[PDB]
Amino acid sequence: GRMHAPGKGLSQSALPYRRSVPTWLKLTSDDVKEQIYKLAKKGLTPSQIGVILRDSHGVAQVRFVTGNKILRILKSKGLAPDLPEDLYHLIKKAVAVRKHLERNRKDKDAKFRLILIESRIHRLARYYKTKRVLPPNWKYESSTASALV
Amino acid sequence: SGALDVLQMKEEDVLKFLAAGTHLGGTNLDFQMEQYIYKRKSDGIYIINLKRTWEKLLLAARAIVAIENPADVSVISSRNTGQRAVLKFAAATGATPIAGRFTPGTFTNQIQAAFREPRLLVVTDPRADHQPLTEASYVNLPTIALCNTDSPLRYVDIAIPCNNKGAHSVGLMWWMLAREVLRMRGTISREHPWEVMPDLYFYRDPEEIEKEEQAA
Amino acid sequence: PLAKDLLHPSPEEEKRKHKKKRLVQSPNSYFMDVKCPGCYKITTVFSHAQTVVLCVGCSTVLCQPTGGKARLTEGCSFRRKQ
Amino acid sequence: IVKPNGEKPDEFESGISQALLELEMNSDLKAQLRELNITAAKEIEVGGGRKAIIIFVPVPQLKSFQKIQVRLVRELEKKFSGKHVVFIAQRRILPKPTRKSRTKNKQKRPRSRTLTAVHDAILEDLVFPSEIVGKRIRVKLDGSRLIKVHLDKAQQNNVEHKVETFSGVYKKLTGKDVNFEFPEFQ
Amino acid sequence: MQNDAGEFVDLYVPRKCSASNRIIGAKDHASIQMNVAEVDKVTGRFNGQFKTYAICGAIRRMGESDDSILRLAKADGIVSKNF
Amino acid sequence: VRMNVLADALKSINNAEKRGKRQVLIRPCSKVIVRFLTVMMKHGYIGEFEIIDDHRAGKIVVNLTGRLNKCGVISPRFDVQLKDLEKWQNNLLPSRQFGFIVLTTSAGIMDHEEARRKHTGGKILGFFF
RNA sequence: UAAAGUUGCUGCAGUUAAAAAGCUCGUAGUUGGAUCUCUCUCGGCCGAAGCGUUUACUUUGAAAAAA
Ligand SMILES: [Mg+2]
Ligand SMILES: [Mg+2]
Ligand SMILES: [Mg+2]
Ligand SMILES: [Mg+2]
Ligand SMILES: [Mg+2]
Ligand SMILES: [Mg+2]
Ligand SMILES: [Mg+2]
Ligand SMILES: [Mg+2]
Ligand SMILES: [Mg+2]
Ligand SMILES: [Mg+2]
Ligand SMILES: [Mg+2]
Ligand SMILES: [Mg+2]
Ligand SMILES: [Mg+2]
Predict the structure, then answer these.
(1) Residue E30 CB burial class (10 angstroms; 0-12, 13-18, ≥19)
(2) How far apart are CA F74 and CA F125, in angstroms?
(3) Can you tell me the distance from the alpha carbon of C41 to that of C44, in angstroms, rounded to the nearest whole number?
C-alpha cells in the first residue's frame, strides 16, 4: 500500500517480455542520444524526456535502444542536475504548502500534509546520503528550502 | 460414446431436441454448470451444447445398465410434469417409481412401511427433488440428475444438461434415456426406430385433457 | 474448479485478466502510424499518449490526450504497428 | 579473416576463410566481409547423420554480422555440401569468486561474464532469425531438467527445419537438453 | 503395513478416492462406489465388463463429483475425446 | 511487506492441497524454493513441476498427487547441531517411520537423514509429511 | 518443584468471559524481494612467503581440578 495513505492501488506499467528494438524503428543510438541532449538542454527532466520520446518518436524504452538509462546518459555528458528530481519535486511541494499555510493559520489539514511531506523528504534525503549522492552535511531546513529549489 | 460410430447422435435425435427446446436454458448460469453451456445469446438465454448432453445421457445409461437387478434403480419425480414420464420409464425399464411427494426417512427410517434400499437414484430436478438428494448422502447412494443452467450440483454424480422446465423436454429426455438403456441391454435394436413415440411421456395438462374430451 | 490447466490458459482467458495478473506480463498499449489529410508525413504515435502531438511539417494537432487513451483529430487515419 | 586468440588455425578454419574470400570476391558484400573477421570454427554431428558448422565470431562484430546473417548463411550452405551453418559469438567465462580464489579477483567480475548470462546469450544468438518470446523449465520426476523455448510465429517457416540442429548445438556447447516450440499467439 | 519379517499386519486395507486420493473411512456414508458398463465397439450391447470408480463424500459435498467422474470416464475412453 | 518467500510458497501449497486442487501456482520463484521442491519430489510427495520464466523472479506450477498431509516452514532459521537433531525430529515429525526435516547445510539442501549420513549440521528450513 | 499450555521460547490469550493506545507521524530496536557454477618467486612433487574481502554456521583437534 501507500507509504502515507491507506490506499492500496495496483496501477503501474508492465514492460513487454521482448527486449529487442522493433524493426520499424529507424533511429540509431547516437540519434537518440542527440535528441536526449537537446531535450535536456531545453530544460526537461529525464521523466519528461522519456514521455516525449515515447509519445512522439516511437521510442518505447531508451535502455533497450541505447543500452543506458536517461540519468546515466546525462551524467556521462555532464548535463545533470545537482540534486535528484524527485527530491526537488518534494521540496518544491513542501515550499508551496508552507507558503500557503502562512496566509491560512487555521488550515490544520495543510499542517498535517506538510508534516507528511517533510517526513518523506527526510526519508529520501537519508537514503541519498547513504549512497553518497548528497554530501554528508546536506540538511533540509524550512528557511533554506526556498533557496534550495 | 467412446467415439464409436454406432453410438453417435443421428439427425432425427437433433430434430427432436430442437423441437422440444432442450437446448434453451435459463437466464442464470451456475458456476459448475458452465462446461456444458455453449454461448449466451441476446435476451440473456443460455444455449446448451447438445453433444455434451448426449455424452452425459450415454454415460448415465451405461451407469444404469451396469446394475444387475433392474428393481434396484429408483426414479423420483416431485413436479407434476415429470410424474408420467417417470412412470412410463419405470414400466418400460423395470425401475421403482416415486411420483409426487417423497416421504422423509424413506432411505433412513428402517421401520417405516415405505423403507427402501435402492442402489441408484435418478431425479428430474436437483432444486425440486433436493430431499431425496440429501438422503442419498446418508446411505452411499449415487445420483443422476437432469440439471439446468442454474442448478446446484451437490451430491450429483452424473448431471445431464437438458431443459427441465418444459413438459416436452422432460418427456423427451426420459424417453431417450429409456430407449438408450433398453438398446444397451439388448432388448430393442438400433437398426429401426422404437415402436413407442415420445409423446407418451409428456405431461397431460388436464386443460388439454378437457379440450380433447370435447373433440368428439 | 479442482481441474484446470494453469500452464496452458486459453488465448481469451489471458486477454481478460489484468495485465499484471497474467502468466507473463504484457501491456495493452501499442504504437501506431497516423496520417493527417493536409500533409503527407506519417507520424508514430503511442496509443496512450499524454502530450499533444503536432505535425512537424505543417503544425497540425494529430491527437488530444484523455484519461485512458489519446483521441485522434477528425479526418486522421491510423494503422497499428506489427 | 581468421584471427584466433590462440593464434593457431586449423584446416576447417582455413577452408571457411577461403570460402569467405570467395564471397568477398564474387558477391556484392565486399566491404562487410572485408571489415569483419571470425575467431574460430567447429563441426559437430547431430540428427543421426546431419552435420552442423559453428562459426565463433568476436562479440564487437556480432551486430555487424547480423546484418548479413541470412544471406551469408545461404551462400555458405550453397558453397558447402548439405550441412547446417550457425554463427555464434565468442563469450568468455569467468569462474565464480571463492574464498581460496587468488588475485584474479583484483577486479569485480562483470555480470556479462557469467555462466547464466553467457548461456542465455548463446541461446538467443543460436536462433537469431526468430526471436524468443517465452521460456519454460520442466523438472522431471528423476530430477533432470528440460528447457522449452518459444519462437516467433512470423519466422516459423524460415527456421522450422533447423530446430534439431539447434538442440544438438546447444547440447554440445552448453550441455543441456532444449526443445523449441511455436505458440499460436498471445 | 508389514513388519521386518514381511508379514502383513492389518485388519483391512481401506480404499482411496479416485478423484482426490484421500482415504475413505469406515464411517464415511457419503462415499459412492459406482460402476460404468462397457459396450462392444461393433454392436453396442452390454459387454459384461465394467469400470469401477470410488468418490469420497468430501468431494460430493463440494459438488465436484460430476467433473471428477467426467474426467475419469474421459481418461478411460468411455467418453468421446471430442466431448 | 513480504519478508519470506518459502513461507508463502509452502502456505500456498498446503492450502491448495487441503482443497483437493491438482495444480498450484506459486510466485515469486527462488532457487531455495526449487531445492525444497526437489527434496519433496525425490520422496514422491508432489511430482513434476515446471518453472515459468518471465524476466522478473519467475513462477512455478506444481502438480499435486494427494499424498501431502502437511508442509511447513520454521522461522527463524535456527542453527541445528547433529546432536540436537533428535529433539527437532520428536517435536516436528508425526512418527519415526515417515516424515522429513529439511536442512540447509554446507554440503547443500537436504533432509535430516541425509545430513546424518554425511555427518554435518546446518540450519533448519522446514518440514513435510 | 511438578501438576501450570493458570507467565506459554517450545506453548497461552485480547468481538461478547480480564484485555487493541482516540488517531496519525517518527528516532532507537526488530525484520526485510529476486539474481553471480589458490598463487608467482626463492630453496629441498614439496619447503618458505602471501593466502582468503572477512565473518556468522557446521564438522574436527588441542587445552581444559578432584569429588
Ligand atoms: Mg508506513
Ligand atoms: Mg498510477
Ligand atoms: Mg510451580
Ligand atoms: Mg507440562
Ligand atoms: Mg496461581
Ligand atoms: Mg507442545
Ligand atoms: Mg488463560
Ligand atoms: Mg470486556
Ligand atoms: Mg480503535
Ligand atoms: Mg527505524
Ligand atoms: Mg534475501
Ligand atoms: Mg574442570
Ligand atoms: Mg570434573
Answers:
(1) buried
(2) 6
(3) 10
| Alpha carbon distance F27, F62 (integer Å) | 11
Resolution in A: 2.8
- For residue A51, give the nearest of C19, C51, C82 by CB distance: C51
CB contact under 8 A, C31 and A60: yes
- Verify that A60 and A94 share a domain, yes or no: no
Does residue B128 lie within any of the structural domains? yes
DSSP three-state, residue D15:
helix
Among the partner-chain residues E36, E41, E65, the one whose CB lies closest to the CB of B63 is E36
Contacts of F41 in chain D (CB under 8 A): 139, 141, 143
The last residue of a domain, from among A57, A80, A103: A80
Q: Is C34 on the interface with A (CB under 8 A)?
A: no
Domain shared by A136 and A118, yes or no? yes
Query: DSSP 3-state assignment of C31?
Result: strand
Q: H or E stretch including B71?
A: none
Peptide bond into F28 cis (omega under 30): yes
Q: With the CA atoms of B19, B22, B24 and B30 taken in that order, what torsion angle do they form, in degrees rounded to the nearest 10? A: 180
CB atoms within 10 A of CB C16: 10
Q: Please name which of D124, C55, B63, A149 lies closest in space to residue E36, comparing C-alpha atoms.
A: B63
Residue C63 in marked binding region: no
Q: Give residues 31-90 of chain F lying near strand G (Cβ < 7 A).
A: 31-32, 56-58, 76, 79-83
CB atoms within 10 A of CB B35: 14
Q: Per the domain annotation, does B139 fall within a domain?
A: yes
Per the CB < 8 A criterion, the answer to whether E27 and B136 are in contact is: no
Q: Is the CB of A123 under 7 A from strand G?
A: yes
Q: Quote the minimal CA–CA distance from E9 to chain B in Å.
A: 29
Cα–Cα distance measured from residue C48 to residue E51, given in angstroms and rounded to the nearest whole number: 58
The method recorded for this entry reads cryo-EM
Please check whether residue B85 is in contact with residue B92, taking contact to mean a CB–CB distance below 8 angstroms.
no
* B110 occurs within a structural domain: yes
Residue B68, CA distances (Å) to B94, C26, D157 in order: 11, 58, 59
Chains in contact with B, where contact requires at least 3 CB pairs less than 8 Å apart: E
Same domain assignment for residues A113 and A130: yes
CA distance E10 to D81: 71
